[PDB]
């Protein structure tokens, strides 16, 4: 009788721990997906910003050249 | 002069509140699995 | 006697697993908060950068127009 | 005019797929630890 | 006999739960490291961008001053 | 010309080292809960 109680409580606890492990795996997967997407977003932003700053640098250098040629 | 567009660069948000709530619910429910001989 | 030992060890293990689940939930909550704050920060930075680059584009276009009108 | 360089600013990526796979494997293997009197 | 079965199944389950806790700790550590590195990257990008925008502002103000002095 | 300010855009850091340390401590302490008949 007490053995049946121990076995039933243990099976219930193992089921709850299985659910907890599945939910922890799901949460870690979602966190991984979002962290990786934000990392790709930051890298894309850095690349686009490098391109934009190169463009602004070229344009500003041309403007400085024209200002020198004028004055 | 046409600078590149960066408006599309978006950062997703995570919503694991269901999983955290379920983990706390299980941590509370495991008291119903304790053995009282 | 052995049943009391099994029950005591099982209750101890379930208490430790409850503590572990609470700490995992706390860690996942902190990670969620920080990932979401950094996502909001990246989005705010992208919006402000779009505004700033629009402003720089307008100013540079005006400068190019003035340089054309001069030369 | 020389604007600062930002190309080095990189964002690492996380690879916890091994750990998630192992967690799901353990959640499946805990069925082999159930008691069948 | 049934007690030996209960003890063996419980020891197996506790070993598997120990493995799961170690793997959850490792995953949370990796996520923490990556989230913190991306946070440092975003902060470094914000600082460098502030410097670059200050530089562009100074240069553009000088250009506007020169355009005023010319016309 | 006055460009917008972005210095306030900050990125928080996470400190779950207490929780990771406690998880490893529990994974080590669960050896004291094994049954030795």
Author numbering:
A (entry chain B), C (entry chain A), E (entry chain C): 918 to 988
B (entry chain D), D (entry chain E), F (entry chain F): 1164 to 1200
In the authors' words:
In each case, the process of viral membrane fusion is mediated by the trimeric viral spike glycoprotein (S) that is cleaved into S1 and S2 subunits by multiple host proteases upon infection. Two heptad repeat regions, HR1 and HR2, distant from each other in the prefusion S, drive membrane fusion by assembly into a six-helix bundle. This HR1HR2 bundle formation is thought to provide the energy for membrane fusion and is therefore a target for therapeutics, as exemplified by peptide inhibitors that disrupt infection by the HIV-1 (19, 20), SARS-CoV, MERS-CoV, SARS-CoV-2 (23–25), human parainfluenza virus 3 (26), and respiratory syncytial virus. We therefore designed a scaffold to efficiently determine structures of the postfusion HR1HR2 bundle and its mutants to near-atomic resolution by single-particle cryo-EM.
We determined single-particle cryo-EM structures of the five selected single mutants and the Omicron triple mutant of HR1HR2 using the same molecular scaffold (NpDps4) and data processing workflow as for the EM structure of the wild-type HR1HR2 bundle. For example, the D936Y mutation causes a large conformational change of the side chain of HR2 residue R1185, while the S940F mutation results in disappearance of side-chain density for R1185, suggesting disorder of this side chain. Thus, in both cases, the salt bridge between D936 and R1185 is disrupted by the respective variant mutants. This salt bridge disruption is associated with decreased cell–cell fusion activities for the D936Y and S940F mutants (65.8% and 24.6%, respectively, relative to that of the wild type). We observed various effects on neighboring residues for the D936Y, S940F, V1176F, A942S, and the Omicron triple mutant. These structural effects correlate with changes in fusion activities for these mutants —the D936Y and S940F mutations result in a loss of a salt bridge along with a decrease in fusion activity, the V1176F mutation on HR2 slightly displaces Q957 on HR1 along with a decrease in fusion activity, and the A942S mutation introduces an additional hydrogen bond along with an increase in fusion activity. The fusion activities of the D936Y, L938F, and V1176F mutations are ∼60% of that of wild type, while the fusion activity of the S940F mutant is ∼25% of that of wild type. Overall, none of the five single and the Omicron triple mutations dramatically altered the architecture of the HR1HR2 bundle, as indicated by the small RMSDs between the wild-type and the mutant structures.
